[PDB]
């Protein structure tokens, strides 16, 4: 569970790594108007 | 194994919400296009007279 | 196999198997575990020291030296294996004093990543609500 | 690519804030539950870190009683039934060397050999298992990549009909402007 938990925490990482991207990219987009 | 399960509770949930965005955008383009079509034969209609 | 008891994680010396779990026991353990608990540990299903299946396989077990062996060198020796046991049992104490503090400071990690995940996505949605 | 992203990952982390009601109730652990009192005065010892009470020496080599008792014939005679113990003691030790030197050879040899049969039986379950997780990862590995070649199929179509829809909204805006000026232009003449 601990583990589990863990690369769960790691997962999230992955999560956010790609939303930070999708972010980044979206508000590139409306600079482009 | 655990992992795996969430990927699969992840794959379709992925899969429903970025189709559904594609579909809202290809009806956008829909609505957006009949208009647009629509202006250009009233334009027609202006360019007989 | 050459068997370990599912208890002891180490080779009985009067084996049983229980058929609720097809694991290997060591009887005198799993007869005392039953009387205080009423279950197979692994799964915690009911078991009974009547539904316990015996076996009488001969047992190859060897003296770890017998060079170094006599009466009052035995008991000098099982001392040591018996404060090296306590220290054991002890360390998984510990352990699993442990495990409990590292867990838990994971858990509070990844449950405020939740929180963080929410903001994002109405983050991420007003963005393209943007773009439309 | 992703070892820049896991810096920025951490960003939120950083701003966490007092909230920490956290998960591990969840299945508290019992320490107590099969717990003698004579156990629990070990682990009371070793929370101590008490040294050990050493078992006596002693006996091994007592010669005599001590002066005091030296004039006191049932203190002689235990010495005497001491010395009596340890000579049975040696009695049975080189007993116990005589069968050592010819069998122990063999067994060790036999032992050890079974040492090698645990290690090959472990390392043939090791192996199921290293192939059973990397079968596994092969499972994971087909699946996000298949997934994920339709998802970017499907991205670079939302991308391209994104782009193009609001090319066809400025385009549209081309028209409502240019349609304006001829019905001006055709209104006024």
Not at chain 1, 3 to 32: F, G, M, N, P, W
Not at chain 2, 9 to 32: G, N
Not at chain 3, 104 to 119: E, G, K, P, T, W
Not at chain 4, 150 to 163: G, T, Y
Request: hydrophobic share 35%; net charge negative.
């Amino acid at each position: 569970e601990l583990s589990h938990a863990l690369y769960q925490h790691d997962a999230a990482c992955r999560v956010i790594a790609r939303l930070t991207k999708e972010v980044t990219a979206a508000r590139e987009a409306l600079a482009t108007l | 194994e655990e992992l795996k399960k969430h990927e699969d509770s992840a794959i379709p949930r992925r899969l429903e919400c970025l189709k559904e965005d594609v579909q809202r955008q290809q009806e956008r383009e829909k609505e957006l296009q009949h208009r647009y079509a629509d202006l250009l034969l009233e334009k027609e209609t202006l360019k007989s007279k | 196999m050459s068997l370990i008891c599912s208890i002891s994680n180490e080779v009985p010396e009067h084996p049983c198997v229980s058929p609720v779990s097809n694991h290997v026991y060591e009887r005198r353990l799993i007869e005392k575990y039953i009387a205080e608990n009423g279950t197979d540990p692994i799964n915690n299903q009911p078991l009974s020291e009547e539904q316990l299946i015996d076996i009488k396989v001969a047992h190859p077990i060897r003296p770890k030296p017998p060079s170094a062996t006599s009466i009052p060198a035995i008991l000098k020796a099982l001392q040591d294996e018996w404060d090296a046991v306590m220290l054991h049992s002890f360390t998984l104490r510990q352990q699993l004093q442990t495990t409990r503090q590292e867990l838990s400071h994971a858990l509070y990690q990844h449950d405020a990543a939740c929180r963080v995940i929410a903001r994002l996505t109405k983050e991420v949605t007003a963005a393209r609500e943007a773009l439309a | 690519v992703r070892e820049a992203a896991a810096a920025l990952v951490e960003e939120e982390t950083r701003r966490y804030r007092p909230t920490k009601n956290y998960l591990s109730y969840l299945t508290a652990p019992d320490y107590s539950a099969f717990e003698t009192d004579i156990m629990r005065n070990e682990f009371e010892r070793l929370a101590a870190r008490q040294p050990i009470e050493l078992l006596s020496m002693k006996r091994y080599e007592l010669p005599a009683p001590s002066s005091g008792q030296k004039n006191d014939i049932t203190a002689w005679q235990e010495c005497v039934n001491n010395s009596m113990a340890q000579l049975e003691h040696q009695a049975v030790r080189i007993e116990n060397l005589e069968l050592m030197s010819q069998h122990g050879c063999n067994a060790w040899k036999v032992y050890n050999e079974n040492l090698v049969h645990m290690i090959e039986h472990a390392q043939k379950e090791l192996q199921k298992l290293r192939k059973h997780i990397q079968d596994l990862n092969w499972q994971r590995k087909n699946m996000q990549l298949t997934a994920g070649s339709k998802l970017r199929e499907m991205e670079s179509n939302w991308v391209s009909l994104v782009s193009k829809n609001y090319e066809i909204e400025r385009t549209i805006v081309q028209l409502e402007n240019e349609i304006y000026q001829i019905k001006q232009q055709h209104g006024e003449a």
